């Protein structure tokens, strides 16, 4: 009919959603968790020092075995490291040196990456020839690839610079489902423990929940005031944290449909680059733009410790599947492990 | 305490040597970033010098060049402009004829104003503090022909001078250079694009050589 009525209905729906979220807010998390003992100080030291890359590292991901981890840098080469021996398993020379995202399949057979180039290059690590070759080139995106994660052994979902997301099939190499709910550049992407849901953050200061089978937006959060740089799913699959430039992390829940609490400090004025949860979820490690990484309590929201092993902006952060250690990457061209 | 990991360590050392060699070969080539409003100017510059990121390799006087064109991206630069922090110099292209022509969705905005704003934003960026800029003023003959009838005061009301080429050219050069704030750290290399070839490449080579000299002198503390 007319745009006036549509905008009025949208505003009414937003007001109704806000009223529902306000009414659902019975109690807070800080007041209840006050009866829990504090985690105290945690002292983590650099157990290993990886000095293979020669450029700024931007992304990394742990494998299912909790021993192998892939890393991407601006030099245009991917390196598979052995955490126990720091050995280089394979060196994948990338055709595009502007890589800023990488993924490690759960089966340990294929690895993906991307960046300014809209084409996502897939690589197989268990070829009979013994040399890593390009498995398939997934093209079709308009903006730069920000994050990618292997949904399964044959399916992969990635986010592009544009305000859309797509799910690719390695068998055919076509967009099985295209999401068009975001209104800004997508920067983060994380899969849920059940593999049926996944969350993604964009520069529109909001985080939305998507469904793989349904292919529609399940929920939308608007607790942040700036762009979201990272997102991680809670181990239980009912919550997820997000990092933004406003230096105020916010935890959300899929069942409450709102922000539980926030993590921030006065001296902390720099933005967040990466966020990850421990195996139990009690510790929330987040890497900032500063040369240090802080550890936050998921329940008490206190600085349990700080990591001053790097001398440059922290770019990525990933905890092992077994929670035995955590690796932190930075633009200093080094990748260290903490525990 | 090693039985079979000896071959693994040997492979690791070989891979490290290969990566170090590739890095020594990678850093051996000069890297440049191509920016500027308008696609015709950048296209003409790339043609004279010979989708996503567009990669181009061309050697001149035994010096390698890696031209980076991000005009086809069309996205918020705030989240990926920092990737070019290590570039040597940024080539900014702007057509002088734009002083009169405007974009489609202008709403009382001149294309020259948008070009100047983009130049100021890219110059005063925190990631390009020590990165030089090479400004090329394209469409020389077209601009010289338009100024014969269309005056320059249409875009710059404060301009008070003769509607000639030399005066207007110098005024535009000053206006583009005035946008620079780091007069001590920055160094803008301005040049008027010519129709004949083998001229812009020479200026680019000279500017790259000067920037390399200045960088090597600053790294030692003598500049």
């Amino acid at each position, epitope marked *: 009919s007319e745009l006036d009525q549509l905008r009025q209905e949208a505003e009414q729906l937003k007001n109704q959603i806000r009223d529902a979220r306000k009414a659902c807010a019975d109690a807070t998390l800080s007041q209840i968790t006050n009866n829990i003992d504090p985690v105290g100080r945690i002292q983590m030291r650099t157990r290993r020092t990886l000095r293979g890359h020669l450029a700024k590292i931007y992304a990394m991901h742990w494998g299912t075995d909790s*021993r*192998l981890l892939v890393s991407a840098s601006q030099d245009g080469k991917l390196i598979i490291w*052995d955490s126990y*021996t720091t*050995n280089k*398993v*394979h060196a994948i020379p990338l055709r595009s040196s502007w890589v800023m995202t990488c993924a490690y399949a759960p089966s*340990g057979n294929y690895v993906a990456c991307g960046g300014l180039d809209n084409i996502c290059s897939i690589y197989n690590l268990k070829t*009979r*020839e*013994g*040399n890593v070759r390009v498995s398939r080139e997934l093209a079709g995106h308009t903006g730069y690839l920000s994050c990618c994660r292997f949904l399964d052994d044959n399916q992969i979902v990635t986010s592009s610079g544009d305000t859309t997301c797509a799910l690719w099939d390695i068998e055919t190499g076509q967009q099985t489902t295209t999401f068009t709910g975001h209104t800004g550049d997508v920067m983060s992407l994380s899969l849920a423990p059940d593999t049926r849901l996944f969350v993604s953050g964009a520069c529109d200061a909001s985080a939305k929940l998507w469904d793989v089978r349904e292919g529609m937006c399940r929920q939308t959060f608007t607790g942040h005031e700036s762009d979201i740089n990272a997102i991680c799913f809670f181990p239980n699959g009912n919550a997820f944290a997000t990092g933004s430039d406003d230096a105020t992390c916010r935890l959300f829940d899929l069942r409450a449909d709102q922000e539980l609490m926030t993590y921030s400090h006065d001296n902390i004025i720099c933005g967040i680059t990466s966020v990850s949860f421990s195996k139990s979820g009690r510790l929330l490690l987040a890497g900032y733009d500063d040369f240090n990484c802080n550890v936050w309590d998921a329940l008490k929201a206190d600085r349990a410790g700080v990591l001053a092993g790097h001398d440059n902006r922290v770019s990525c952060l990933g905890v092992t599947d077994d929670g035995m250690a955590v690796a932190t990457g930075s633009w200093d061209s080094f990748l260290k492990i903490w525990n | *305490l090693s*039985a*079979e*990991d*000896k*071959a*693994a360590v*040997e*492979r690791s050392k*070989m891979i490290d040597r290969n990566l170090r060699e590739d890095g020594e070969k990678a850093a051996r080539e000069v890297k440049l970033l191509l920016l500027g409003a308008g696609e015709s100017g950048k296209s003409t510059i790339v043609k004279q010098m010979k989708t996503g990121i567009v990669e181009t390799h061309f050697t001149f006087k035994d010096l390698h060049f890696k031209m980076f064109d991000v005009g086809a991206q069309r996205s918020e630069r705030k989240k990926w402009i920092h990737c070019f922090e290590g570039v040597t110099a940024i080539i900014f292209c702007v057509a002088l004829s734009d002083y009169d022509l405007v974009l489609a969705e202008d709403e009382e905005m001149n294309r020259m104003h948008e070009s100047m704003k983009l130049f100021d934003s890219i110059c005063n960026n925190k990631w390009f503090t020590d990165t030089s800029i090479i400004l090329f003023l394209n469409k020389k003959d077209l601009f010289e022909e338009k100024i014969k009838k269309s005056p320059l005061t249409i875009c710059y009301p404060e301009y008070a001078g003769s509607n000639t080429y030399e005066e207007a050219a110098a005024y535009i050069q000053c206006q583009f250079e005035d946008l620079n704030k780091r007069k001590d750290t920055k160094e803008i290399y301005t040049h008027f694009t010519c129709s004949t070839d083998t001229k812009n490449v020479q200026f680019v080579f000279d500017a790259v050589t000067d920037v390399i000299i200045k960088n090597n002198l600053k790294d030692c503390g003598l500049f």
Partner: single-chain antibody
Amino acid sequence: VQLVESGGGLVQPGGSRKLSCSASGFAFSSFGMHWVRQAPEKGLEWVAYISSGSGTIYYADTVKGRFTISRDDPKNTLFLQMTSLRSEDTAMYYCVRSIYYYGSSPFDFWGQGTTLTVSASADIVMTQATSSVPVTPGESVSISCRSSKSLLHSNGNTYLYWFLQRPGQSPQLLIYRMSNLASGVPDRFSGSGSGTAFTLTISRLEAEDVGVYYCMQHLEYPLTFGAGTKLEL
């Protein structure tokens, strides 16, 4: 993936021969090469080994210093120069590739081999309980062996590799480290071990299993193969 070996034939005592093998289908530079000798009335036997970077070249005691191995990276051809060949060296030689990394499967591909006929201590000892056992299709069989030293290394890995040599074909890797099966091997094969004693269980035996099963240890460079267990239908 194919390895065409050449340079066999007859040779008089004390002579010299240069065995050549051209690699194709894979990166010859990245893979290391192994020479496995097998006499007409004996089992497999390790000869020499060369790494990818042509470094750390080790030879066996029986051929220590007498033979030498070389390779050509740009040519992708393996060379084995033998001098002062003895009568005891009369046997067929096999060429095997190997790549070492976390999760690798060394000794996965075995070449054809060329027959070489000569005209007229402290190493790991592998001993098998039985050399020949009768088998029938559809039944389940097990092969057991023993080692003079515990192969279980401090890192938890056990350097034990099993091979099967069918009549008229080269050996094939069945199970490496007793935990991961080689590519293309049916899942009906299973292996176990206790640090010193090892066993190989083959369920649902088929005519394709008729052959001689060999065992190999890789904890020490002086490899040593077992006596070999032959399964007769």
